[PDB]
Amino acid sequence: EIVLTQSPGILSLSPGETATLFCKASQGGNAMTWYQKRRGQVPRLLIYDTSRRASGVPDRFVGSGSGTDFFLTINKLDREDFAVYYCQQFEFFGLGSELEVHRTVAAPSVFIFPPSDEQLKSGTASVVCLLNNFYPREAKVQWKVDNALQSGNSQESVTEQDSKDSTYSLSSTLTLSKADYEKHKVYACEVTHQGLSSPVTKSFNRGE
């Protein structure tokens, strides 16, 4: 079988710049195919036979390579070019490289939301921490309950990169039983992010 290894995993660049994406095959001598997949859209063939552009593909997409090393070059990046790109040879595929929009670092605004009494009435407590409008996407959110770090009991979700301001938002949801919730006082989410000179903490005291 052929193993295709794409890099980098994420590429951060601005409109107008040129992106270079790499695909290394475990076997040499075959031609390379590339696809574009914009978020939520059908995949689109870009390049076949290593360097030939598919139907309706603009000339700023340039495929090249030889042996085991293959490249997709995207000149003068357009807003639409920010997408995930996959390489293929025969039935084998790379795991994809994401091209994302670079912009200035932006610290998240952080908010914490205690669970509602109505949800508590039902036996479960959801505590939510929102990190709004930040860049880059990488952030560390830590839940602490009475200063004990919580792990394995929260789930995160992240928005798609905003099409206009290139920021992300993230939510982390700590889920506890009502009995567990009512045994502790201080609930806090600590956020660590490049845009912050030191970690930011938002918290509340249960029933206060």
Partner: protein
């Protein structure tokens, strides 16, 4: 000086004007007489690139055979894209004859004489001829019948072996007769006999050749994974009747690996069908029941058509299944050593 080029070929043959046999009749109207003293010139110091998988001579043969079958093998009923066509469908005389393909003035055929030429890349021993050798337009699936043999070693042909979608042509260097009969006195039931000792030895050699191309992985045969009977069975036409033979016994891994019992006669079960899926891609055709008497044709198996399994594997073996089904491949197996060039 010359250059790769495509042109309209013409055909030559020794068809008889008095024959009612259908290939004879077609060639009489389509072809010219064969040349008694063919000129063949070896080209000294000349190397030439070939590509049997991109050879327009193949397209032209295909069109002719389609033409022949359309003129000659009219079915009692034709079912195409939801339409119906009823016609006379008399029994016929059917027995393919050799057809030569030839270049007109201003062109010539370059022929590759390299003993183990696999159909593509450079040829060092090249000659110039006006016509291909005589090629019988035998339409079959799974097995190539009554064709030419590889001159030295068994040859593996594929446009791209790494590509599981490309048919593999195994070109044998020694033929094995297959003997098919529908006895006189179920009228549609028939069978094909092969010498097991003959065949299993050949098939062993085949698997050994495949190892050379497939990293010495264990070579394993499986039956076709699906499809119409024309492709899941060995399909061919004998005396105008459409045969379908179950080739399961032909690809018995137990035999090729070294056991006992596998020598002696293999008898494939076959059936003649009146309702067939047309290889021309035209739909379904309905023919009258079989003629009476012992329907029998003995052929040389000279080639095998295979597909190889793909997928995210990394097992210790490769799996091959009889198949293909693109009749153009039959013409490729005979035209592989030829290409047309234009003189200036």
């Amino acid at each position: 000086v010359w250059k790769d080029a495509d042109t309209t070929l013409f055909c030559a043959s020794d068809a008889k004007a008095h024959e009612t046999e259908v290939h004879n009749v077609w060639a009489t109207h389509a072809c010219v007489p064969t040349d008694p003293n063919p000129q063949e010139i070896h080209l000294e110091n000349v190397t030439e690139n070939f590509n049997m998988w991109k050879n327009n001579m193949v397209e032209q043969m295909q069109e002719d055979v389609i033409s022949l079958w359309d003129q000659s093998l009219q079915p009692c009923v034709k079912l195409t894209g939801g339409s119906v066509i009823k016609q006379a469908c008399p029994k016929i005389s059917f027995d393919p004859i050799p057809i030569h393909y030839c270049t007109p003035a201003g062109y010539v055929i370059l022929k590759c004489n390299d003993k183990n030429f696999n159909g593509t890349g450079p040829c060092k021993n090249v000659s110039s001829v006006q016509c291909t050798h005589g090629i019988k337009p035998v339409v079959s699936t799974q097995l190539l019948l009554n064709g030419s043999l590889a001159e030295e070693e068994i040859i593996i042909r594929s446009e791209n072996l790494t590509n599981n979608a490309k048919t593999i042509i195994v070109h044998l260097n020694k033929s094995v007769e297959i003997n098919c009969t529908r006895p006189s006195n179920d009228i549609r039931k028939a069978y094909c006999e092969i010498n097991g000792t003959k065949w299993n030895k050949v098939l062993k050699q085949v698997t050994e050749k495949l190892k050379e191309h497939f990293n010495n992985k264990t070579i394993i045969f499986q039956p076709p994974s699906g499809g119409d009977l024309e492709i899941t069975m060995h399909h061919f036409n004998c005396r105008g009747e459409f045969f379908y033979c179950n080739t399961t016994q032909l690809f018995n891994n137990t035999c090729i690996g070294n056991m006992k019992g596998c020598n002696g006669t293999i008898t494939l079960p076959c059936k003649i069908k009146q309702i067939i899926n047309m290889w021309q891609g035209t739909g379904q055709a309905m023919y009258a029941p079989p003629i009476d008497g012992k329907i029998n044709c003995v052929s040389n198996i000279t080639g095998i058509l295979l597909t190889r399994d793909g997928g995210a594997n990394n097992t210790s073996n490769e799996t091959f299944r009889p198949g293909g089904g693109n009749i153009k491949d039959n013409w490729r197996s005979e035209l592989y050593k030829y290409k047309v060039v234009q003189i200036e």
